[PDB]
Design an enzyme around this catalytic site. Structure first.
Site, PDB file in Angstrom:
ATOM      1  N   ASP A  15       0.804  -1.215   0.000  1.00 19.53           N
ATOM      2  CA  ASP A  15       0.000   0.000   0.000  1.00 19.53           C
ATOM      3  C   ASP A  15       0.837   1.265   0.000  1.00 19.53           C
ATOM      4  O   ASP A  15       1.312   1.701   1.037  1.00 19.53           O
ATOM      5  CB  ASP A  15      -0.905   0.000   1.218  1.00 19.53           C
ATOM      6  N   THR A  16       1.010   1.866  -1.167  1.00 21.41           N
ATOM      7  CA  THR A  16       1.810   3.083  -1.257  1.00 21.41           C
ATOM      8  C   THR A  16       1.108   4.260  -0.588  1.00 21.41           C
ATOM      9  O   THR A  16       1.746   5.253  -0.287  1.00 21.41           O
ATOM     10  CB  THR A  16       2.106   3.442  -2.734  1.00 21.41           C
ATOM     11  N   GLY A  17      -0.192   4.134  -0.325  1.00 17.22           N
ATOM     12  CA  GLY A  17      -0.976   5.182   0.375  1.00 17.22           C
ATOM     13  C   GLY A  17      -1.001   5.070   1.894  1.00 17.22           C
ATOM     14  O   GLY A  17      -1.802   5.757   2.554  1.00 17.22           O
TER      15      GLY A  17
HETATM   16  C1  LIG Z   1     -11.462  -1.850  -0.760  1.00 21.94           C
HETATM   17  O1  LIG Z   1     -11.468  -0.663   0.039  1.00 21.94           O
HETATM   18  C2  LIG Z   1     -10.505   0.352  -0.330  1.00 21.94           C
HETATM   19  O2  LIG Z   1      -9.812   0.192  -1.360  1.00 21.94           O
HETATM   20  N1  LIG Z   1     -10.465   1.416   0.475  1.00 21.94           N
HETATM   21  C3  LIG Z   1      -9.543   2.496   0.200  1.00 21.94           C
HETATM   22  C4  LIG Z   1      -8.677   2.592   1.430  1.00 21.94           C
HETATM   23  O3  LIG Z   1      -9.172   3.046   2.452  1.00 21.94           O
HETATM   24  N2  LIG Z   1      -7.413   2.182   1.332  1.00 21.94           N
HETATM   25  C5  LIG Z   1      -6.424   2.161   2.437  1.00 21.94           C
HETATM   26  C6  LIG Z   1      -6.067   0.682   2.591  1.00 21.94           C
HETATM   27  C7  LIG Z   1      -7.304  -0.124   2.921  1.00 21.94           C
HETATM   28  C8  LIG Z   1      -7.791  -1.025   1.996  1.00 21.94           C
HETATM   29  C9  LIG Z   1      -8.932  -1.778   2.273  1.00 21.94           C
HETATM   30  C10 LIG Z   1      -9.575  -1.589   3.490  1.00 21.94           C
HETATM   31  C11 LIG Z   1      -9.080  -0.693   4.429  1.00 21.94           C
HETATM   32  C12 LIG Z   1      -7.935   0.042   4.143  1.00 21.94           C
HETATM   33  C13 LIG Z   1      -5.117   2.891   2.107  1.00 21.94           C
HETATM   34  O4  LIG Z   1      -4.500   2.454   0.882  1.00 21.94           O
HETATM   35  C14 LIG Z   1      -5.228   4.357   1.843  1.00 21.94           C
HETATM   36  N3  LIG Z   1      -5.407   5.145   3.051  1.00 21.94           N
HETATM   37  C15 LIG Z   1      -5.456   6.526   2.516  1.00 21.94           C
HETATM   38  C16 LIG Z   1      -5.266   7.606   3.554  1.00 21.94           C
HETATM   39  C17 LIG Z   1      -4.098   8.356   3.579  1.00 21.94           C
HETATM   40  C18 LIG Z   1      -3.923   9.346   4.539  1.00 21.94           C
HETATM   41  C19 LIG Z   1      -4.901   9.620   5.497  1.00 21.94           C
HETATM   42  C20 LIG Z   1      -4.656  10.688   6.531  1.00 21.94           C
HETATM   43  C21 LIG Z   1      -5.045  10.501   7.856  1.00 21.94           C
HETATM   44  C22 LIG Z   1      -4.799  11.487   8.806  1.00 21.94           C
HETATM   45  C23 LIG Z   1      -4.143  12.651   8.418  1.00 21.94           C
HETATM   46  C24 LIG Z   1      -3.753  12.801   7.090  1.00 21.94           C
HETATM   47  N4  LIG Z   1      -4.007  11.833   6.190  1.00 21.94           N
HETATM   48  C25 LIG Z   1      -6.070   8.869   5.469  1.00 21.94           C
HETATM   49  C26 LIG Z   1      -6.256   7.876   4.511  1.00 21.94           C
HETATM   50  N5  LIG Z   1      -4.395   5.014   3.932  1.00 21.94           N
HETATM   51  C27 LIG Z   1      -4.645   4.788   5.240  1.00 21.94           C
HETATM   52  O5  LIG Z   1      -5.774   4.631   5.712  1.00 21.94           O
HETATM   53  C28 LIG Z   1      -3.396   4.795   6.100  1.00 21.94           C
HETATM   54  N6  LIG Z   1      -3.351   6.108   6.746  1.00 21.94           N
HETATM   55  C29 LIG Z   1      -2.295   6.884   6.595  1.00 21.94           C
HETATM   56  O6  LIG Z   1      -1.280   6.630   5.937  1.00 21.94           O
HETATM   57  O7  LIG Z   1      -2.410   8.149   7.259  1.00 21.94           O
HETATM   58  C30 LIG Z   1      -1.300   9.058   7.181  1.00 21.94           C
HETATM   59  C31 LIG Z   1      -3.288   3.698   7.134  1.00 21.94           C
HETATM   60  C32 LIG Z   1      -3.538   2.362   6.420  1.00 21.94           C
HETATM   61  C33 LIG Z   1      -1.860   3.690   7.709  1.00 21.94           C
HETATM   62  C34 LIG Z   1      -4.311   3.843   8.262  1.00 21.94           C
HETATM   63  C35 LIG Z   1     -10.278   3.783  -0.192  1.00 21.94           C
HETATM   64  C36 LIG Z   1     -11.436   4.165   0.748  1.00 21.94           C
HETATM   65  C37 LIG Z   1      -9.247   4.917  -0.306  1.00 21.94           C
HETATM   66  C38 LIG Z   1     -10.844   3.580  -1.592  1.00 21.94           C
END
Ligand SMILES: COC(=O)N[C@H](C(=O)N[C@@H](Cc1ccccc1)[C@@H](O)CN(Cc1ccc(-c2ccccn2)cc1)NC(=O)[C@@H](NC(=O)OC)C(C)(C)C)C(C)(C)C
Lengths: 99, 99
Positions: B25-27
């Site tokens: 997960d690059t995100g």
């Molecule tokens: C099948 O569901 C998905 O693909 N869900 C995606 C999703 O939530 N992807 C998550 C990974 C994931 C997949 C399946 C179920 C649950 C989670 C991540 O790729 C993207 N997400 C995207 C994201 C990126 C930043 C932030 C954020 C939070 C606080 C402050 C600033 N940014 C929130 C969400 N990152 C985070 O939530 C990360 N958060 C993070 O790196 O925070 C710095 C975690 C993981 C470490 C918690 C979306 C809703 C974006 C479409």
């Protein structure tokens, strides 16, 4: 390009007249953008991430420019913390993970 | 290897004798595993995703095997819907996003 992962992989995208920063996210099925009033039909959806679900508006067949690459596909709009480019559009730019 | 993004980039990892499926997960800033027991000291942390925050336990210096690559770093454990390999460990395996 080849983007290392020491920093968040943020790029500038263009959707109509609007320039925005967005995160290239291999863990996102879908592309999710912060609130904006795009043209045309939409459908309400729910999508899930860490922390639970959000409600989004699903717009289909939307042109987005990502680092000069033109893609056309589905964009979800809603209360996302950051603009996210997910796999549906990453595949259209020919993105892969390499190691 | 090169991993295309047509499907979720799910790989098998090994941690402390256990096999798990995890998303590259690059995100994700951080690596977050679904609830499990790990040895050693931990401290609570709040991490945010698209739907809000979850409370997790932060373990430092945990060895993980990812696609034949041995890494060592911080692993968060908590109520994530999916095991996530974040940038802290992606950088250790030398992963890049290419397009
Ligand atoms: C099948 O569901 C998905 O693909 N869900 C995606 C999703 O939530 N992807 C998550 C990974 C994931 C997949 C399946 C179920 C649950 C989670 C991540 O790729 C993207 N997400 C995207 C994201 C990126 C930043 C932030 C954020 C939070 C606080 C402050 C600033 N940014 C929130 C969400 N990152 C985070 O939530 C990360 N958060 C993070 O790196 O925070 C710095 C975690 C993981 C470490 C918690 C979306 C809703 C974006 C479409």
């Amino acid at each position: 390009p080849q983007i290392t992962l020491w920093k968040r992989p943020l790029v500038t995208i263009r959707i109509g007249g609007q320039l925005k920063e967005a995160l290239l996210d291999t863990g996102a099925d879908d592309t999710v953008l912060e609130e904006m009033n795009l043209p045309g039909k939409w459908k309400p959806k729910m999508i899930g991430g860490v922390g639970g679900f959000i409600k989004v508006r699903q717009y289909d067949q939307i042109p987005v420019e990502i680092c000069g690459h033109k893609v056309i596909g589905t964009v979800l709009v809603g209360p996302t913390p950051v603009n996210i480019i997910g796999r549906n559009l990453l595949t259209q730019i020919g993105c892969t993970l390499n190691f």
